[PDB]
Amino acid sequence: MDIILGIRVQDSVILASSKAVTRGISVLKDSDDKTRQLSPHTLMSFAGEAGDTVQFAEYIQANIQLYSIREDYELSPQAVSSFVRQELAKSIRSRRPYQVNVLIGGYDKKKNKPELYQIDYLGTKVELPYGAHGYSGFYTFSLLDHHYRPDMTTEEGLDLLKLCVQELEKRMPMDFKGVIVKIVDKDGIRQVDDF
Amino acid sequence: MDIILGIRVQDSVILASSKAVTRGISVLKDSDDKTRQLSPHTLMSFAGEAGDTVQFAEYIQANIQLYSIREDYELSPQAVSSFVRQELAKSIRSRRPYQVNVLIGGYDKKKNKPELYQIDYLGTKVELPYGAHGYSGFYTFSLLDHHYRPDMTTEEGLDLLKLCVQELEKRMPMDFKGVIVKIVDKDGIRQVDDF
Amino acid sequence: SDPSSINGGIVVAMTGKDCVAIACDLRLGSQSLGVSNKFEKIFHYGHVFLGITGLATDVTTLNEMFRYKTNLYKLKEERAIEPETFTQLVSSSLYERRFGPYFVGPVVAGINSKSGKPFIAGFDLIGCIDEAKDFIVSGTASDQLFGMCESLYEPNLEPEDLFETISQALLNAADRDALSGWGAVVYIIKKDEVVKRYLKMRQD
Amino acid sequence: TTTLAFRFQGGIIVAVDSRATAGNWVASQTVKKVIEINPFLLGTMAGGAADFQFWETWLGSQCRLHELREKERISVAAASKILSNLVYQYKGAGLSMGTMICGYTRKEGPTIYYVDSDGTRLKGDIFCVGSGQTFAYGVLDSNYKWDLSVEDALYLGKRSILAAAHRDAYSGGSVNLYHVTEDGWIYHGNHDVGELFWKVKEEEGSFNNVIG
Amino acid sequence: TQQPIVTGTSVISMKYDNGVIIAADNLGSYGSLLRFNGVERLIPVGDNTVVGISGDISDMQHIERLLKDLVTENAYDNPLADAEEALEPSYIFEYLATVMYQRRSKMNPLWNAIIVAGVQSNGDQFLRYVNLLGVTYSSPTLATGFGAHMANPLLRKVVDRESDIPKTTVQVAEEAIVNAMRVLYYRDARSSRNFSLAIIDKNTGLTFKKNLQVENMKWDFAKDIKGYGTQKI
Amino acid sequence: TTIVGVKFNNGVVIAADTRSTQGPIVADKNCAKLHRISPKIWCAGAGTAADTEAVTQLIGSNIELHSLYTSREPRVVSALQMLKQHLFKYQGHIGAYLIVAGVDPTGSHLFSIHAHGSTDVGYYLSLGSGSLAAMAVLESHWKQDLTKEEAIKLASDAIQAGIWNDLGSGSNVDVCVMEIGKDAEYLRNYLTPNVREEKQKSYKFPRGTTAVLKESIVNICDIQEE
Amino acid sequence: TSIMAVTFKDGVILGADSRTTTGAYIANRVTDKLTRVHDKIWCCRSGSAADTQAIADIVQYHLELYTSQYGTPSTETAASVFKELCYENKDNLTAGIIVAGYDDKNKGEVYTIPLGGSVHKLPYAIAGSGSTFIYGYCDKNFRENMSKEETVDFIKHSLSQAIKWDGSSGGVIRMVVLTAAGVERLIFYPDEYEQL
Amino acid sequence: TSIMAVTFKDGVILGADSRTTTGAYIANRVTDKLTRVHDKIWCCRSGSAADTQAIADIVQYHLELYTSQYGTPSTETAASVFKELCYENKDNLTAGIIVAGYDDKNKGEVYTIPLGGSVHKLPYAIAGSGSTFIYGYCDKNFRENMSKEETVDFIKHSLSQAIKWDGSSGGVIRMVVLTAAGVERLIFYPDEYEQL
Amino acid sequence: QFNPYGDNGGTILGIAGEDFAVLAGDTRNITDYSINSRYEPKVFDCGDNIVMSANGFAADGDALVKRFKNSVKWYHFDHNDKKLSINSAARNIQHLLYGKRFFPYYVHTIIAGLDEDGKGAVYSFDPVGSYEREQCRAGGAAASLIMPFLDNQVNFKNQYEPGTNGKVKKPLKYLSVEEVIKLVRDSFTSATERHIQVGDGLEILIVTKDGVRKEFYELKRD
Numbered sequence A, B: 001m002d003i004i005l006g007i008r009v010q011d012s013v014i015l016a017s018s019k020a021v022t023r024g025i026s027v028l029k030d031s032d033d034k035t036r037q038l039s040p041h042t043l044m045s046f047a048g049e050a051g052d053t054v055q056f057a058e059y060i061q062a063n064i065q066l067y068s069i070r071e072d073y074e075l076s077p078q079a080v081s082s083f084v085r086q087e088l089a090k091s092i093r094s095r096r097p098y099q100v101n102v103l104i105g106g107y108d109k110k111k112n113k114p115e116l117y118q119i120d121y122l123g124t125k126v127e128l129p130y131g132a133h134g135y136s137g138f139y140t141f142s143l144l145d146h147h148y149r150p151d152m153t154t155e156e157g158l159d160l161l162k163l164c165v166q167e168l169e170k171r172m173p174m175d176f177k178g179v180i181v182k183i184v185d186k187d188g189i190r191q192v193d194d195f
Numbered sequence C: 001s002d003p004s005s006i007n008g009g010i011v012v013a014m015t016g017k018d019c020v021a022i023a024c025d026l027r028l029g030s031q032s033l034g035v036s037n038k039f040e041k042i043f044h045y046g047h048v049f050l051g052i053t054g055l056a057t058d059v060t061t062l063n064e065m066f067r068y069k070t071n072l073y074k075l076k077e078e079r080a081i082e083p084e085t086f087t088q089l090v091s092s093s094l095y096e097r098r099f100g101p102y103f104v105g106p107v108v109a110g111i112n113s114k115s116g117k118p119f120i121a122g123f124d125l126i127g128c129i130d131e132a133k134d135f136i137v138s139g140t141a142s143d144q145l146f147g148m149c150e151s152l153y154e155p156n157l158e159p160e161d162l163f164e165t166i167s168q169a170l171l172n173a174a175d176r177d178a179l180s181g182w183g184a185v186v187y188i189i190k191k192d193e194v195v196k197r198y199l200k201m202r203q204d
Numbered sequence D: 001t002t003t004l005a006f007r008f009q010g011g012i013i014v015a016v017d018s019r020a021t022a023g024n025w026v027a028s029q030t031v032k033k034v035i036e037i038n039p040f041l042l043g044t045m046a047g048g049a050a051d052f053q054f055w056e057t058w059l060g061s062q063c064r065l066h067e068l069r070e071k072e073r074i075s076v077a078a079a080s081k082i083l084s085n086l087v088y089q090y091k092g093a094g095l096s097m098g099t100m101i102c103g104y105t106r107k108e109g110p111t112i113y114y115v116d117s118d119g120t121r122l123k124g125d126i127f128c129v130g131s132g133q134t135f136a137y138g139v140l141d142s143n144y145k146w147d148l149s150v151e152d153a154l155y156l157g158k159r160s161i162l163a164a165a166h167r168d169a170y171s172g173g174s175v176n177l178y179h180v181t182e183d184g185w186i187y188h189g190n191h192d193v194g195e196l197f198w199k200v201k202e203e204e205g206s207f208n209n210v211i212g
Numbered sequence E: 001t002q003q004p005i006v007t008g009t010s011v012i013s014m015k016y017d018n019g020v021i022i023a024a025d026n027l028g029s030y031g032s033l034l035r036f037n038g039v040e041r042l043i044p045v046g047d048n049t050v051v052g053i054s055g056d057i058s059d060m061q062h063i064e065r066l067l068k069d070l071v072t073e074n075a076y077d078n079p080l081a082d083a084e085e086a087l088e089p090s091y092i093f094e095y096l097a098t099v100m101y102q103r104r105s106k107m108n109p110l111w112n113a114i115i116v117a118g119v120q121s122n123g124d125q126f127l128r129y130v131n132l133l134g135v136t137y138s139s140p141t142l143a144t145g146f147g148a149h150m151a152n153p154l155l156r157k158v159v160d161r162e163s164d165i166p167k168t169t170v171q172v173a174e175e176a177i178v179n180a181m182r183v184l185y186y187r188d189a190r191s192s193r194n195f196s197l198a199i200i201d202k203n204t205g206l207t208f209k210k211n212l213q214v215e216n217m218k219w220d221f222a223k224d225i226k227g228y229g230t231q232k233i
Numbered sequence F: 001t002t003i004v005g006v007k008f009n010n011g012v013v014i015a016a017d018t019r020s021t022q023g024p025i026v027a028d029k030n031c032a033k034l035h036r037i038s039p040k041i042w043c044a045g046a047g048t049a050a051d052t053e054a055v056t057q058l059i060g061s062n063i064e065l066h067s068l069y070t071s072r073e074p075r076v077v078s079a080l081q082m083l084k085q086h087l088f089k090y091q092g093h094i095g096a097y098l099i100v101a102g103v104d105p106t107g108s109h110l111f112s113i114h115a116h117g118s119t120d121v122g123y124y125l126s127l128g129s130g131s132l133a134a135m136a137v138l139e140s141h142w143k144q145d146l147t148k149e150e151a152i153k154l155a156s157d158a159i160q161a162g163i164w165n166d167l168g169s170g171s172n173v174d175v176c177v178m179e180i181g182k183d184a185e186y187l188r189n190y191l192t193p194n195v196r197e198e199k200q201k202s203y204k205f206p207r208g209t210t211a212v213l214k215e216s217i218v219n220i221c222d223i224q225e226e
Numbered sequence G, H: 001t002s003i004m005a006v007t008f009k010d011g012v013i014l015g016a017d018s019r020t021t022t023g024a025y026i027a028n029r030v031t032d033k034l035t036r037v038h039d040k041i042w043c044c045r046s047g048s049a050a051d052t053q054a055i056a057d058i059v060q061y062h063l064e065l066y067t068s069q070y071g072t073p074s075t076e077t078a079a080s081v082f083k084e085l086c087y088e089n090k091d092n093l094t095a096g097i098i099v100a101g102y103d104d105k106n107k108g109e110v111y112t113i114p115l116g117g118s119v120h121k122l123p124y125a126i127a128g129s130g131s132t133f134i135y136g137y138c139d140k141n142f143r144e145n146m147s148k149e150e151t152v153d154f155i156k157h158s159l160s161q162a163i164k165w166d167g168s169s170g171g172v173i174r175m176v177v178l179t180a181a182g183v184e185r186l187i188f189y190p191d192e193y194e195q196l
Numbered sequence I: 001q002f003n004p005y006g007d008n009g010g011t012i013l014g015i016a017g018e019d020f021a022v023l024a025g026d027t028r029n030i031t032d033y034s035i036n037s038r039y040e041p042k043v044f045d046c047g048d049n050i051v052m053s054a055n056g057f058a059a060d061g062d063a064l065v066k067r068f069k070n071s072v073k074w075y076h077f078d079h080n081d082k083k084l085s086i087n088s089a090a091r092n093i094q095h096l097l098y099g100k101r102f103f104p105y106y107v108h109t110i111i112a113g114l115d116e117d118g119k120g121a122v123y124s125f126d127p128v129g130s131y132e133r134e135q136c137r138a139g140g141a142a143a144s145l146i147m148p149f150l151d152n153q154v155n156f157k158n159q160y161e162p163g164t165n166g167k168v169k170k171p172l173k174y175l176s177v178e179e180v181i182k183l184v185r186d187s188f189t190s191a192t193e194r195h196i197q198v199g200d201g202l203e204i205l206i207v208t209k210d211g212v213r214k215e216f217y218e219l220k221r222d
């Protein structure tokens, strides 16, 4: 799929992901949620080749949920991101690799810190204050470089995120049919229904 | 992937043409008029390969304006369309052909009839009630097949045109930044500033 | 396309008098796009330091792999691995992937705890050992680093002088490379103390 | 490369970077990417080119010949079209250039024309061209207004190039500013990015991601 | 653009104290077939220059006619054609170098590597190389094809730099050339035993030696070599 | 790379330059191209550096185990057979071009091995990008019944020819002499005809020249007691 | 490469040049292309040196193991083992091999195995790049039941021409004589065979 | 194609096969490859039939016009005109031509012009695909100043072998004798030359 | 297929002083892994106190230099023996290079001399004619090895003044002709060590108001 964004603020992680699904000439759907909840305080958005994206996201989801049941314990965002990276790093030298780029936004309940991880299909992990995949970064990073602070509130983060989406809507050729925004904080994961 | 549309109603010809200009990754402009007035009662919209489009449109424009001055007489839409077709038919077997598709909407003051001509870069002329170039037709023709009448008013034509643009805006992947609509009738050529 | 220059980056190592220095830039990119200015390329296992340039996923993978192997080494041997031994381990590990190699340019640096002798070594992506006396270079600006090191370097430099030499070798090489820069780190290594310094450099 | 140019109250701002690369190798950090065509017209460069050194210097000769013949300053529209018609003859022949022909005349006012190696010729208010254009557009769009002071407009252009110089690997070196009125273009300093970045970071409170 | 068909291999040459020596074998190869065994590839121009040519033989023959025509043209309205205004090595070379570069620039090259060896009016040694690309260079030793790889190393042991030229006699230089020709016969799969050798001396003039043969070859040790490793019989 | 081997009266000598290259860049100026398969069987290697090292180590390891198994000093033909069969299996993809030499109970031996697994016997051999410059010298100066002193001279002269005339070769000359009834002597940097001249200037910087953001002590020691 | 094997009254003689080439460079000018798979069964090798050596090595192993179990193998048996390798691995091999041997029962025999892997029993055989130039000569000059001296002259003259015209062939002319008397090696140097 | 020209005491003889092939189909089994550019200057044609005919036609035109102005041309002159065409149009031609002629002053001469466009004056010349197989034979059996009958036998035996081994060559052996006496055509059928 | 281009290797270096200019270049000429010549002059005096070198493909390089020398000659004829200024020479070369835009001179051209104010001047070109005045420029095979060193030692990049810690830069003090030659020699000695196409000899041409002077230095021959 097309545009996925992430921004880590003071006390939460915010993930924006486009709603459009284009199969060639037509936009088949304009309300697609390009994300999966891996655990109560860990959310992974994704974008890449069709099929591979969901297949991968659900495979990861199942594995983390299996871990959660076995140990009766939620893995840290760092731990989940490392697991995910290894799966992609394993994948890239396979017969047919997973062609999937992901953002992992999680709130670490132990350290009481939000954490955003950006991992591409090669298995290239980086912890960031704000991240993106594909052409999304080319437009947004210049805005985020300017306006971003580590002590921003969630409402300030959403406003900065709106400014990013507006710039994408102005300068990107593809109509991505807006974004679904989700917030990950100490209280868990919720969706901003109006954006 | 520029969208240019045409519809011939009772007493006028209406040409809609997208405003977007995309140079790869960025939309450089969102207010581009993809049309030239060849004569007071003849308008040509165009879409094709960058540079070639305007170069061709202006070359045609100059030739028709030269004819108008020489004879102190406006050529019929049919005559202009035939001239244009020949230029493209000549072009296709050149060293470097004009890669330009056009719609020629004109009002014939002799016969008191609106006329719409669709000509592709190969020099393939067809007189139509409604026409389009590129992928535009794939979405719109099904709507036009259903709703079109030969006795429609200009206001009814604009409403049917809005329905076409809405469907394009819904199902096309590319954001073409809306359209500039122009009407060609007995009184000449005017632009619908609000659309 | 070329795996060794997608992410970009550089590593350089030098020997001094009773000391070694290893240094790297901090850039990680997706070709033209700069992605991270905190991607450190120098890791350490005990007193043995390893810098890795090249494809970032493999940089990470190999660090995790040599951490894995040096930890088991320590449990069984009941002692920390030495630079000479680690160099051989790196070479072995890389060559076993001969026809499906990690796209990396590793650089070992450290001081032998028993003999006190300063040691550096470089590798190609399939395990060939380049055990130089003077200096080792690696990454997208290796040509530039070769040019800097070959002119700036002199033997038997004191730790605080060596720091200036390696820092200037890296900085000026990185500035003549589009895919390197965005910060830099220099490790000055002595027999029983290690100082790590972040350099202030142009951020373009 | 990052080059921008935008119309505003005080005329036109033009801002460019200074970097030239051959692959990953940085060839030059000191490149003039603004051809001072004459005292009243400016032109930018981008695209693996420098074809535009020859052709925009040539354009200056054509513009000089025009005002000798017509006893009148050439229009921005006429100047830009001489260049666009020229490159159109050479269409298909080589690589990828992109330019902004900038000027201010009495009849037109402040005018910018995006001319392109594919033959494209677009009039417009704002343009960013080059490998770092998207980064520049981000800063420019969010902070652009018609009612900007000459001081603030100059800074916005400087800041937009800095934004791209930072992210885009093939942009950087230094920023060359120009301000264009009908009385002529005015040069506004060569600004090294190495020094400009730390200056802007500290003063503006931006680039919190980077450690300094 | 073409491909070479009938080809001539190495042309080797060096300077010595009073002049230059140049040599080339008498073979015209047709791929792996050693088709023509009587081909002269050293072509003298006047009594002070010898042009040695390798590569395509049809193009060589064309160049040969150009040089022949050059001498004719130089004699026209030139009372000093056999004296002050006679053709120099430098004149003959620059002409060829002009042609070779012009032809490469029309994407229709004369598929050759040429070495113009000679002695100037003032007694200076002339030795310069030119090829199908129009590339030119001069050196105390020059060689084409395989000669570049095998002859030069041997010839450079005699004249390693400019200062060694006055110290090298014609006997020592000729010996080095003749030895180099033997080495090329051992190791070049498209060479012949028969060759021609030319000496252009500022005192004794042009000496052109035809029908020379590689002699004093070492082959006896072949009898002792058996199998490719473990075989004893 | 220039590597040579030369037979003589009572043994065999091999030699090699010390330049390693990646394209037009010199990767190592003092590379070690002479590899020890066993105490009295040494080989010189050209082509891909990792391969010549790896393939020699492997065969050398198996040769050692074989020598312990058979209670006999290893033979050159064993190293030759084991190398060629390995290289052949990999169809030239292991880029190792070797000159294998040594002394054993059978006598003194000199062989060459190519990447595809072909072997050649000879009294004088040369491999690598400078083999043509080396072979020119060998063909000009080699004779039967060479002494030890003459063979070392001829071998190092052949390497020099490559060093000077071939851009793929350079720096120093390594030699290894393996005489019958004697320990093999490995002469590392036998010749050093390419020492760099003194630089015109010292580029030692004044301390505090480099701008620094942060400093910190790195904990290399283990977790501490108390 | 110019190789040939010729049967005569007393047995068979194998003949070969000594040139190994990497393109136009002569990698080895004193190569031994006549190689031994058994006491009195030898072969001439053409094409890839690596392939023909690997093959010849394996064949010698098979015939050594054959001998240990079933006694001395026939020349036909040796040719069959060569064939089995060349045929079954035709996609990955470039080997033109001439097998030649001497029994007391069958006397001198010659089998040629070209690229395909096919076997062809003949009175004499020629192969390698340089053989093309001597088809005419060999066909005209070959007789059956020649003497040893006549057969040596036939091979010497034939290979001399093959060498003269083929760039890939050259050096010394090696020969190996296979008769009841035993195994005799012969060598002929350029100065001798060139003037013929 | 197997073609050859051989000088002898009384003059020169041109020889050729008669096979024209489209791949493996014999388009013409009775082709005349010996063609006349002047009274006593002929040529043997190999390679493209279309190219060699177009060339030979043009050469005959040039020598006819030469004769009208400057009298009878030399065989060298004829070879030079052939060369000029083959050399200057080397990119678009596939023609291997042997020129052979008889003067009273120069007697029998033979010039061979291979693909490149180069000229080579020789005592005798062989060319065409089938010539490869008779380099060895022709080199061994050629003598200078042979008789007419000896030269006919030399060509017959040579081309016989070339035909025997080369698929592209076959049919009848045509010959053309050029001497002071005049121009004699000879033909030799399969039954005659195959049993040699 | 015929490839009309080739790489003859080598490396050149131009440094502009306060009242002088140097244009240095190694004398080694090569193809692939063979040395053609150990001394083949690459930097030429073109008259009017201008020195030039067109590094890369020697045939195109020799052609270009030849044509510029010719341009200088015809400049004197056509304009009353007027001295061709370095800025005018540079622009003239742009037109020579761009004149073959669609079949380029495969060379990296550098000229050096004095501007009309007497100050040192170095101009640098790409193969298709783009040019720019510079204080410092290395061109050719080993340009990537030399330029970073020159940024550091000529323009004092990344160097700051002790005690201030990154706050105050090192001042851009002018370099003497003796100081420049030291940097030139060390650049080529270093380039020779790590680049196989660089060596044999170093020829430097120094341009002052007094005229053009030459200096030659040995380089390693391996």
Ligand SMILES: *[B]([O])([O])[C]([C][C]([C])[C])[N]C(=O)[C]([C]C1=[C][C]=[C][C]=[C]1)[N]C(=O)C1=[C]N=[C][C]=N1
Pocket: D001, D002, D019, D020, D021, D022, D023, D027, D031, D033, D045, D046, D047, D048, D049, D050, D130, D131, D170, D171, I126, I130
């Ligand atoms: B910019 O990055 O587009 C820049 C503009 C140019 C006028 C200096 N282009 C270049 O630097 C190009 C390479 C390139 C990089 C990225 C996108 C497109 C092109 N280089 C050159 O034009 C160049 C390189 N070396 C010498 C001279 N010119």
Ligand SMILES: *[B]([O])([O])[C]([C][C]([C])[C])[N]C(=O)[C]([C]C1=[C][C]=[C][C]=[C]1)[N]C(=O)C1=[C]N=[C][C]=N1
Pocket: C123, C124, C128, C130, F001, F002, F019, F020, F021, F022, F023, F027, F031, F033, F045, F046, F047, F048, F049, F050, F052, F128, F129, F168, F169
């Ligand atoms: B010699 O020039 O053949 C030399 C011998 C080697 C055993 C030290 N070869 C090399 O140095 C090879 C050349 C080569 C380049 C590229 C691909 C394969 C071979 N170099 C290396 O193996 C090499 C390259 N970079 C780093 C380390 N080693």
Ligand SMILES: *[B]([O])([O])[C]([C][C]([C])[C])[N]C(=O)[C]([C]C1=[C][C]=[C][C]=[C]1)[N]C(=O)C1=[C]N=[C][C]=N1
Pocket: F114, F118, G001, G002, G019, G020, G021, G022, G027, G031, G033, G045, G046, G047, G048, G049, G050, G052, G128, G129, G168, G169
């Ligand atoms: B002969 O020329 O066929 C010869 C016989 C071989 C058994 C020694 N073969 C070669 O010389 C081959 C190449 C070749 C030449 C002509 C036809 C077919 C093949 N040479 C090699 O295999 C070779 C080349 N370089 C090093 C080692 N081996």
Ligand SMILES: *[B]([O])([O])[C]([C][C]([C])[C])[N]C(=O)[C]([C]C1=[C][C]=[C][C]=[C]1)[N]C(=O)C1=[C]N=[C][C]=N1
Pocket: H001, H002, H019, H020, H021, H022, H027, H031, H033, H045, H046, H047, H048, H049, H050, H052, H128, H129, H168, H169
């Ligand atoms: B001979 O085989 O070269 C022969 C001589 C020709 C003058 C009659 N040539 C041909 O038969 C050619 C094909 C060819 C075969 C072998 C080598 C080169 C070329 N045949 C034709 O030109 C031909 C084929 N079909 C119809 C007409 N002509």
Ligand SMILES: [Cl-]
Pocket: E228, F118, F119, G020, G031, G032, G033, G049, G053
């Ligand atoms: Cl062999």
Ligand SMILES: [Cl-]
Pocket: H020, H031, H032, H033, H049, H053
């Ligand atoms: Cl015919």
Ligand SMILES: [Mg+2]
Pocket: B118, B119, B120, B124, B125, B126
């Ligand atoms: Mg149509």
Ligand SMILES: [Mg+2]
Pocket: C203, C204, D164, D165, D166, D167, D168, D169, D170, D171, D172
């Ligand atoms: Mg940047």
Ligand SMILES: [Mg+2]
Pocket: F162, F163, F164, F165, F166, F167, F168, F169, F170, I221, I222
């Ligand atoms: Mg060398």
Ligand SMILES: [Mg+2]
Pocket: H163, H164, H165, H166, H167, H168, H169, H170
């Ligand atoms: Mg037949």
